[PDB]
Amino acid sequence: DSFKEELDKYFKNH
């Protein structure tokens, strides 16, 4: 996944 997608997965739980 792209870095932007990894961030999107970060803010899903935070």
Epitope: F3, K4, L7, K9, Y10, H14
Partner: antibody, heavy 118, light 111 residues
Framework: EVQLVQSGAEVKKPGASVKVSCKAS????????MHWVRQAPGQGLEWIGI????????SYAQKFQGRVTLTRDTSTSTLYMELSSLRSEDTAVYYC???????????WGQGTLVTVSS | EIVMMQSPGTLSLSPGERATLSCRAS???????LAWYQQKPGQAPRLLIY???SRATGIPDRFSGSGSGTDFTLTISRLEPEDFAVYYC???????????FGPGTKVEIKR
Amino acid sequence: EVQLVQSGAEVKKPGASVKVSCKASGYTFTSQYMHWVRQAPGQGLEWIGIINPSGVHTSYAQKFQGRVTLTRDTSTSTLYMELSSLRSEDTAVYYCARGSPKGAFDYWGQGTLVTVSS
Amino acid sequence: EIVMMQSPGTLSLSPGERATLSCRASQSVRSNYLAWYQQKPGQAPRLLIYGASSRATGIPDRFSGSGSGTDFTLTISRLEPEDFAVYYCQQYGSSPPRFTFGPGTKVEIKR
């Protein structure tokens, strides 16, 4: 050409608050995360925080937690950086940078100098 | 946090020569997410290299990055007078979001 355009320089008394803006029109910007980086005169670059495309999610550096507020206006494609309780060490050129979908900051604004002087 | 180091502090070379800039990280940089930025006087930083070795759009082939883990290198072959600037290295991570810069290396051009 798509380009980040920041607001003009402001001089603020100590303890006052400052609000810097960054115009980020175009899909290249409105579909990506945006960052704020400051640079004290004669010093390196310091990351302030990051804001998501919708403007709902933010993450601030440990140093600026509780003092900075990142907001984003999607109807005008405008980003904002508010820093409260300005002290002398906050005097810096505040940059607004685009977070590439790959990670690095590939688009930068021209910068905004904030002078905290009595 | 991940502390970034750079060496040398100042580098002074002639046009056509090769400049070698070092960047050391306190931890291993996940996914080799290492970026190099060029900042000329009175200008904003400019992305030269991301992902340790990827040239950004518009960057000439003479700019080159390498390394993995904690040690990274930026090499500027065929130096030109326009290359006078300060060069910062930066790590970036996504989970959790982390962005820390190096102290910078001032590159001066002799003539």
